[PDB]
Ligand binder design. Sequence first.
Ligand SMILES: *C(=S)NCc1cccnc1
Ligand SMILES: *C(=S)NCc1cccnc1
Ligand SMILES: *C(=S)NCc1cccnc1
Lengths: 114, 114, 114
Amino acid sequence: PMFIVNTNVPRASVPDGFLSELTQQLAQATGKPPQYIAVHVVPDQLMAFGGSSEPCALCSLHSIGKIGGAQNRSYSKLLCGLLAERLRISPDRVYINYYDMNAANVGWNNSTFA
Amino acid sequence: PMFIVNTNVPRASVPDGFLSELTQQLAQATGKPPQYIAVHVVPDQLMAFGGSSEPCALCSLHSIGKIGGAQNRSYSKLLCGLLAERLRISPDRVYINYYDMNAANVGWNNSTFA
Amino acid sequence: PMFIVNTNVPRASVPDGFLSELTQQLAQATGKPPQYIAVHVVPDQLMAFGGSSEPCALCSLHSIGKIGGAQNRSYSKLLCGLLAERLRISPDRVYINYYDMNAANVGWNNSTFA
Ligand SMILES: *C(=S)NCc1cccnc1
Ligand SMILES: *C(=S)NCc1cccnc1
Ligand SMILES: *C(=S)NCc1cccnc1
């Protein structure tokens, strides 16, 4: 699993523990060891959401499996909660695109997971 | 709909009003209300297109529906036209990836759109 | 084909010529002309892999075809090798997401491909 957040929140507003918190929470949510989880936060972005430049986030969650209708609804609550508390983003200004990756289409360690 | 532009054009070259213009032009193109539209512009990027560092862009349009053969041609004309007029990027140094997202795979406000 | 690498290594760690090399090597690997190859390198990112901040990368390769089981293994070996030799990123701290794009879903030069 790989989680990416793109936001107009300033860099100084991103807590130093946020990547570790996300790692850990996503391990619990997906049932995967934290070692497998990658997280990426991109602050200071030129963005608008609904025509407004109030705090917002455009995010992606990729996983080989563990993606689906009910799971994604659950992830949205987890992730909106974390973004709300730690980045002070309203949950209605967050989009999360979910990608169920085929193992043959994820490279790692000189090969793929297939 | 969510539109992202990644470009090597410098930040000072992005006009005031660009994000608003994109929002408005996308609302017209897609028929979706501007409240649901997100736009994200990322200048000053280390990029090459065709081995050259002349102005270029790599973009993405995600939408739940409103993606398809003729629609995407229309969008490419619109969006390359904006990049050319506003950012002075040649249309032949732009790629736009189009993604027709399943509503179950788009999270927003503590749920998905399914 | 379009290749994007996001990394926590610093910009000064990216060697002169890296985007050229990537262009060249990807042309060789995909068989596509270099003119159509786009590369994008994003250093100095706020990242974690497995909860560690040691050098890592999150990458994407998009191509209209030339994506598949064996191909992707080959590309992973290539690209992990480059990131290791050039950017001193361990291969086991790189993920590469591969995307086989439908030509109708790729915009370029005011239109889309087929
Ligand atoms: C998230 S995409 N993790 C990739 C992965 C999956 C299974 C085992 N190891 C890494
Ligand atoms: C762009 S991805 N807008 C989101 C959306 C689209 C259609 C219906 N509801 C939300
Ligand atoms: C990479 S996505 N290159 C795009 C492309 C592919 C084939 C022919 N022309 C452009």
